[PDB]
Amino acid sequence: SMVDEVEFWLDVGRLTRPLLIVDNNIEKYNQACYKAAEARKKGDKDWEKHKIPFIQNTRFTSQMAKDILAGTLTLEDLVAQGICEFITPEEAENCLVAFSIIELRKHKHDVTRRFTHVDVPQAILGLAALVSPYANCTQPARVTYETNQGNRFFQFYNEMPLVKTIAHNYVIPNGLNTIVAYMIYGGYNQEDSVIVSQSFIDRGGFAGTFYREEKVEGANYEK
């Protein structure tokens, strides 16, 4: 918009992400507004009745979600229809995105906030970030602010977390649901230390095999 150029890009290396399309009835709204203005000019005073509410929504529905979860529908099918389209960082400069469906519903009848797309919030996080539960209730940087700066192990036992996230539908959980007590017990768990149960260790918790390969290959045994 600053300069009138139009750019088409089709090269490799373009990051892209699907986004649900937001449709509205702005044309009908403008037609109704013009009709109401004409009515005012006529002095009939029903112009208020001519105007119609503005509606912006997305074609995604609960049935589509059920089909997606059932495997009937795929992202290719959605893109083939008008539900969603791929957006790149270059084109994202021309997109006004509602960060969640809650925002779209909040501004459903707001002609002042016409949105071009709806974004699922979890889309702003990677798999590693999505592993952590209730990440929005924690400030992950301050967690590491203290920790900032500074041969294969096979573990026998793993369990699904009691509070599972979406990230565990695509990776194998590695860990255990350990009973943690948040208490002061003798001052042996200070400065990020942790007191462990000897029986928990003996029972095989976090026990495994470490493999080191001598593939490349004084007083010594030789016997």
Binding site: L127, A128, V131, F153, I172
Partner: peptide, 29 residues
């Protein structure tokens, strides 16, 4: 000869060294 394959291999050897979450993240890195 050996120079082609060995040199391409070496270009891959420099760093570029590969639980499942860590490997998948390294791929996505």
């Amino acid at each position: 000869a050996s120079d082609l394959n060995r040199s391409m291999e070496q270009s891959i050897i420099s760093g570029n060294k590969t639980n499942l979450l860590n490997t998948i993240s390294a791929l996505r890195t």
